[PDB]
Write a protein that binds this DNA or RNA. Structure first.
Lengths: 222, 51, 159, 58, 49, 148, 185
RNA sequence: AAUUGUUGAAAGGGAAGGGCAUUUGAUCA
RNA sequence: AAUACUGCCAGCUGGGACUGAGGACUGCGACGUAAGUCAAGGAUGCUGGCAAUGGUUAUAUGCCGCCCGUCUUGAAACACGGACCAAGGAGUCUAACGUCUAUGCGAGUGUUUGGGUGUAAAACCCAUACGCGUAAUGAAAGUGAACGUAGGUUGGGGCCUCGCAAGAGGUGCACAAUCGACCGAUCCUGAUGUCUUCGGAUGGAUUUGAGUAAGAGCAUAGCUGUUGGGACCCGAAAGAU
RNA sequence: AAUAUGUAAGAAGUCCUUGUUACUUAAUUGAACGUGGACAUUUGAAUGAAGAGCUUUUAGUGGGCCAUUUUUGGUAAGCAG
RNA sequence: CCCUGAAAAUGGAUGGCGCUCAAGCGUGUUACCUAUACUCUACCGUCAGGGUUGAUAUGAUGCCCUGACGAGUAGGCAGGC
């Protein structure tokens, strides 16, 4: 019984090959991100310069957090919240923007705050409070092996791949979002910034759509 | 047995993202953009301050 | 006392439409009804034989029986905390076809046609429908469309 | 000594505690309420096709 | 008095039945006494059966 | 029994498992079968239909001896014969020598046709026989003897 | 707090380990638990689950039923497995050779199998011969054939064996069962 | 045990009694 | 050009509080060409003091704190009982049962009505009868369940074969619905024969049953529920001898 | 109008050929049940699901009140509905 | 905004003390304190998903791993003195 070293060496070789593929894919994703951001910036610049206005495409991904307790909730909004996986206060989920999802959010707007997330806050959320759902259990994600095992059928095998699927909605965004447990955030470190949370954002509260302002609140709560 | 947080433990960050070493080496977090310059059209310039 | 009859509180329900009284157009009697077809129920006031009840007005059901001039409809009625099936025989007059099922057969035929044509080469059939996706990027040109400045109007006391 | 007559409060919650269930559907539905002549001819046709299938494939 | 899906039972205990309860606690004693009486009779009646 | 009785666990609870709004009073619905057409009519119609009313005529002094007609189906016909000879008479299927069963002596007064008895000669004696049973026995090759 | 969508701390609703205190039954349950845990054949898991069934959930299986099951195509050379008791049927006359494994065997059924040419083995022997349940066929008796299930679900227009003690005339045959005395059921 | 008398200890601006934590007094491995 | 504002850093670093769970190695990573090392699936090293910390109780301090049990939508109430302690005190038993569970036997099942025996109300043994089930339907007379591999079809665990796997084919116990076959009652039609009025073969039903369709039952014990009994305990104004 | 509400968004499906009937049609003309045969990436809108379905037993319950909105009787009511 | 309209019976209520470029009134911006609320950790119990007869070694109703939850009258079940 001396083959333990042979299996050890084979495991190391396989791990090194896997790490090489992961590094190549991560470099490709970073290059794509930089290219896309620069392309949008220059497109806005040329539209401004050519006597025109650049109408940005509507954001396809939003982050929704629950800012209301589980008491005094009407049954239809309560059911919508359960279907959207918001059963604890200060719980957040990612949502792909469609007509059905927009009408769903319009119903439980009074009890949630949602807005367009950014790559930095998405990465921070996934790194810090990123938890998976394996065998109906909340197993923390501290290695790419678990992610590859539970998501390799969809072409996702690393935490960076999962973050990429979250930020850019693709063919397997539904499964990528379903694999992730809803993020249990804490109260904001710097406070909510308003005297009354249960008022609309235009009316001076946390209730309602915050658009790009959701990033600051999410990072404060995370 | 215990969850260690990325972005605070360099070993765990490097284990999760092998590209982190290359990112730190190339300083991709602070990259200077191309020094291109375009001038807005007179129509937009006047519409900005048209009262 | 109290009154809850077979035609109670149907004054505006079992009533013919404005300028649509008289006999029934000879098109309903020419419709062919088969077992399994989905039909809607709409009572007609001119014919008082085989009229449906108030609850079954506007409900949609499958056809399970064919008779001389009548068809049987299975309607799921919610009583208590369960749905119970109800087999009710109604005349042809107070029953019309449902276009949602016809749209479903049309979509199925187009679905199969696309499954044949696209898969003849085998690339991105995408046979499934999608909701209203967010609009992509667009560029607007102010060539003859200079934005006009708008300001709120003063309050007026017109009578 | 008068008392409350009728109220529908909490009835919806009571009915929804045990979720309202759609009736269980089967491939072969009940053949009751169907035209007796059609049922008789269906029985005859079923016997005929069963005999034909038994004679053809064994 | 009347309840869910249970059978109908006809219990005939409505008079002063508590005063007329006969419990045969002396089954073994009666058997022993009968055997002793049989032996005594057999001895008395001579070898006759 | 007493140790496993729920009263011991109910000790301490004020109502002792009988409720507070409605206490465990005496018979509130009546004694015995009080009410079968007034207030318990719903249960008496949905669980015990047919309790109230008369059905047939009257048979005074009905002795349960004239109706003593025990039944015995055809499948359980060879069980009356002892096992030690049952196999022998099963393999010996000849008309000149066949096993004989006395159903009256066995305690059965009527024989019914059900079981598809094996095609062997046999003799059966019974007070009453059925048409199907007799036809099956004669088709097998046996005969039915009428005894009293 | 959590707006629970389901009952908290709810049991699975299935019976784990037998409720009986039969030492041999517990030993057999332990053996089949070991098998089903360290093997991959679903037969071991099915047998282990059936071992927890109650008396009413474990109806007897007759030798006639065994013969009928073995009469199927390709089932002649198969090992019959009955999780329960195997009874003897006198309505059958020809019993083919087989191999039946069951917990308890009726004396008449065992004699019938021995005379036919088969053998009566236990679940432990069945496991020893076929650890993965190869070439086996599981037989279960009729569960809804009990006399206590006829009375279940009694209601109007159902005909579900009303709970009675005596049978005959003037015993729940009056008004409520005939159209001449009012309504029929 | 309820109740009562002495000895020894403590508290007592129109009640006593309890919980959250500690100082002080008595006692304790 | 600089600056204000917003967003990013897989940029660095200063200060403070809580926590030390796990117990020879197993995995994922980094540094190091390589030995080996590491902040890498949960804290170690060094040093100081004592051999006081801490547990129980009384008082004191800061805050909080309405009287136990019942009725009630609403109790602390100016609603009800309680001055205290000690002793007793309230869902028990019988007969027939319903669901479930356990045991034994099993188309059979139950010794203890009784007899023999007995270390003597203990324990052991036993023949015929009898209770329930194996056949039910009609008021009754009466009759009485395989055209079939005990039917056809769907869903169906398991098993077998092919298949690297996945998947494909066959058989498919149990169970769900439906269509069929047979038995009893009712409505009908009516084959030979004949004590001319008896006999009821064969073919059907939008009819009907607490049926058959390879039996599942019997005995005892246990939780809970119902009935009758005084019936969880206590209490009437009354009636009769 | 808004709100509220029913049905459909597929393998129990679609399509090709043809076996049965005592139904029906002038009629292999229609209806039902079928046999054989073709369509598994993307099984036919989005989301979710400590899994879903089914059976038995039974304790307690059958005097309610209050809050936003709609609203009846009453001038109003911590009034009744 | 303030003033007259504006009067009820024991002595009293923005809680009172009190407050006048307010400590009163409307609005705009930061910092500060806290719920048995939220995030993490330590322990207990319950449930779910599993590993552990290759042993001397016993309690596989035993041991261990991971995840989630823990209110409550009448009432039910289970484990214990």
């Amino acid at each position: 019984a001396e083959q333990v070293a042979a299996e050890r060496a084979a495991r190391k070789a396989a791990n090194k090959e896997k790490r090489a593929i992961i590094l190549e894919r991560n470099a490709a994703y970073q290059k794509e991100y930089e290219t896309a951001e620069r392309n949008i910036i220059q497109a806005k610049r040329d539209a401004k310069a050519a006597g025109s206005y650049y109408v940005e495409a509507q954001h396809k991904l939003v982050f929704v957090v629950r800012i209301k307790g589980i008491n005094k909730i009407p049954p239809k909004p309560r059911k919508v919240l359960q279907l959207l996986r918001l059963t604890r206060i200060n719980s957040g989920t990612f949502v792909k923007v469609t007509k059905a999802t927009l009408e769903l959010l319009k119903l439980i707007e009074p009890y949630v705050a949602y807005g367009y997330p950014s790559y930095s806050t998405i990465r921070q959320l996934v790194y810090k409070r990123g938890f998976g759902k394996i065998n109906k259990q909340r197993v923390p994600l501290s290695d790419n092996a678990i992610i590859e095992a539970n998501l390799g059928k969809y072409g996702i095998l690393s935490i960076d791949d999962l973050i990429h699927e979250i930020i850019t909605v693709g063919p397997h965004f539904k499964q990528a979002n379903n694999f992730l447990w809803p993020f249990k955030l804490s109260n904001p470190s710097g406070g909510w910034g308003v005297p009354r949370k249960f008022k609309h954002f235009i009316q001076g509260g946390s209730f309602g759509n915050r658009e790009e302002f959701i990033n600051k609140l999410v990072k404060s709560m995370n | 047995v215990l969850k260690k947080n990325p972005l605070k433990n360099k070993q765990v960050l490097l284990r999760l993202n092998p590209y982190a070493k290359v990112f730190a080496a190339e300083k991709l977090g602070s990259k200077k953009a191309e020094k291109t310059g375009t001038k807005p059209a007179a129509v937009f310039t006047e519409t900005l301050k048209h009262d | 006392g109290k009154s809850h009859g077979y035609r109670s509180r149907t004054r505006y329900m079992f009533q013919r439409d404005f300028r649509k009284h008289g006999a029934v157009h000879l098109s309903t009697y020419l419709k062919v009804y088969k077992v399994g077809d989905i039909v809607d129920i709409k009572a007609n006031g001119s014919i008082q034989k085989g009229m449906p009840h108030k609850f079954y007005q506007g409900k949609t059901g499958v056809v399970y029986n064919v008779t001389k001039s009548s068809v049987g409809v299975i309607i799921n009625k919610m009583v208590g905390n369960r749905y119970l099936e109800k087999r009710l025989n109604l005349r042809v007059e107070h029953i019309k076809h449902s276009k949602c099922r016809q749209e479903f057969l049309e979509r199925v035929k187009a679905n199969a046609a696309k499954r044949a044509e696209a898969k003849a080469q085998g690339v991105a059939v995408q046979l499934k429908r999608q909701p209203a996706q967010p609009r992509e990027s667009r560029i607007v040109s102010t060539e003859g469309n200079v934005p006009q400045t708008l300001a709120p109007v003063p309050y007026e006391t017109f009578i | 000594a008068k008392s409350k007559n009728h109220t529908a409060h909490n009835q919806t919650r009571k009915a929804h505690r045990n979720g309202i269930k759609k009736p269980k559907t089967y491939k072969y539905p009940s053949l009751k309420g169907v035209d007796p002549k059609f049922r008789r001819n269906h029985k005859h046709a079923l016997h005929g096709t069963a005999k034909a299938l038994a004679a053809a494939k064994k | 008095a009347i309840s869910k899906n249970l059978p109908i039972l006809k219990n005939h205990f409505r008079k002063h039945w508590q005063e007329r309860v006969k419990v045969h606690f002396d089954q073994a004693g009666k058997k022993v006494s009968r055997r002793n009486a049989r032996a005594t009779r057999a001895a008395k009646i001579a070898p006759r059966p | 029994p007493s140790r496993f009785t729920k009263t011991r666990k109910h000790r301490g609870h004020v109502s002792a498992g009988k409720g507070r709004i409605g206490k465990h009073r005496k018979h509130p619905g009546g004694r015995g079968m009080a009410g079968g057409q007034h207030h318990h009519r719903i249960n008496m119609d949905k669980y015990h239909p047919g309790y109230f009313g008369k059905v047939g005529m009257r048979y005074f002094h009905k002795q349960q001896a004239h109706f003593w007609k025990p039944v015995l189906n055809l499948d359980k016909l060879w069980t009356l014969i002892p096992e030690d000879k049952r196999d022998q008479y099963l393999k010996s299927a000849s008309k000149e020598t066949a096993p004989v069963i006395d159903t009256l002596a066995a305690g059965y007064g009527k024989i019914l046709g059900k079981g598809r008895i094996p095609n062997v000669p046999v003799i059966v004696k019974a007070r009453f026989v059925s048409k199907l049973a007799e036809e099956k026995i004669r088709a097998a090759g046996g005969v039915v003897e009428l005894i009293a | 707090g959590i707006d629970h969508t389901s009952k908290q701390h709810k049991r699975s609703g299935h019976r784990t380990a037998p409720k009986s205190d039969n030492v041999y039954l517990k030993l057999l349950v332990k053996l089949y638990t070991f098998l089903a845990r360290r093997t991959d054949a679903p037969f071991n898991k099915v047998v282990l689950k059936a071992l927890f069934l109650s008396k009413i959930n474990r109806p007897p299986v007759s030798v006639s039923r065994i013969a009928r099951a073995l009469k199927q195509e390709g089932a002649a050379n198969k090992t019959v497995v009955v999780v329960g008791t195997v009874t003897d049927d006198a309505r059958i006359f020809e019993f083919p050779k087989t191999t039946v494994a069951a917990l308890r065997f009726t004396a008449g059924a065992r004699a019938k199998i021995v005379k036919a040419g088969g053998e009566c083995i236990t679940l432990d022997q069945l496991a020893v011969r076929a650890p993965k349940g190869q070439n086996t066929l599981i037989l279960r008796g009729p569960r809804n054939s009990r006399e206590a299930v006829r009375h279940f679900g009694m209601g109007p227009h159902k005909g579900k064996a009303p709970r009675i003690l005596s049978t005959g005339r003037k015993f729940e045959r009056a008004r409520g069962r005939r159209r001449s005395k009012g309504f029929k059921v």
